[PDB]
């Protein structure tokens, strides 16, 4: 019944957003809540944020 088929291949690039699941190898899960600016990140004396 099918005369012809056209298959299109889309490549989507997704980065990260609130709602994604993240975990370490140690069984600590997590879901990113807020994406915070580098300005509000806790930093050490050297000034490098986390």
């Amino acid at each position: 019944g099918v005369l012809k088929i056209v298959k299109v291949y889309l490549a989507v690039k997704r980065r990260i957003q609130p709602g994604d699941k993240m975990a370490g190898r140690h069984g600590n899960k997590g879901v990113i809540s807020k994406i915070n600016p580098i300005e509000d990140m806790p930093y050490d004396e050297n000034g490098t944020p986390v």
């Binding site: 490549a11 980065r15 600016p37 580098i38 300005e39 050297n46 000034g47």
Partner: protein
């Protein structure tokens, strides 16, 4: 209500430097350093490559025969190319090169406002004797982080299928740190200093930056002054 002013601005590397502010009253060293760290790290002028149209490439996911870097990776390398302009808000640089060897950032076509702060920055390698890559690299200037996604809304017939967009990286600043050491001026009870150690890709000079920072700072207080 004694006011501050700048003092010796000590360049160390082409990357970073330690600026200093001598006349700070009680506790004001912190009140500034954090407020200055904020505007330094976030809102600053920068020029990052935006639109790139390459030789035979339809999309960022293909491979050009004769170069071992995937097109996606070459776009990513461009996001990290540091340049600076003077009088232009967008300049289109034409890059051409061939032959076996690294293609660096010094092989491009120089323009009146073009200054390449890292001529050694690697765009990609070249694996064959005769293979040639031509690219139109459209660099514009702006503020903040504009990802490639939010750019395809205007669109308005960006039909140039070869014009691959990248994410806007716009910012000079890398790491800003402030340390307040007690500064003893010959006569005063107790005063403090401001040591602002910042870090940059070399596309903005320290005195220019720290000035425009405080500019925006006081500019928002404008409304605040009255009601």
């Amino acid at each position: 209500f004694l006011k501050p002013r700048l003092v010796d601005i000590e360049q160390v590397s082409s990357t970073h430097a330690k600026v200093t502010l001598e006349p700070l009253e009680r506790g004001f060293g912190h009140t500034l350093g954090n407020a200055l760290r904020r505007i330094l790290l976030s809102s600053m002028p920068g020029c990052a490559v935006t639109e790139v149209e390459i030789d035979g490439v339809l999309h960022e996911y293909s491979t050009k025969e004769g170069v071992q870097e995937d097109i996606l990776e070459i776009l990513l390398n461009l996001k990290g190319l540091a340049v600076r302009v003077q009088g232009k808000d967008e300049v289109i640089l034409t890059l051409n090169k061939s032959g076996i060897g690294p293609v660096t950032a010094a092989d491009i076509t120089h323009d009146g406002d073009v200054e390449i702060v890292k001529p050694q920055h690697v765009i990609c390698h070249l694996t064959d004797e005769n293979a040639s890559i031509s690219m139109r690299i459209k660099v514009q200037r702006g503020r903040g982080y504009v990802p490639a996604s939010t750019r395809i809304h205007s669109e308005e017939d960006e039909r140039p299928i070869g014009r691959l967009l990248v994410d806007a990286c716009y910012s000079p600043v890398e790491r800003i740190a402030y340390n307040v050491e007690a500064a003893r001026v010959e006569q005063r009870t107790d005063l403090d200093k401001l040591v602002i150690e910042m870090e940059t890709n070399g596309t903005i000079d320290p005195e220019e930056a720290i000035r425009r920072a405080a500019t925006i700072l006081a500019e928002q207080l404008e409304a605040f002054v009255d009601l």
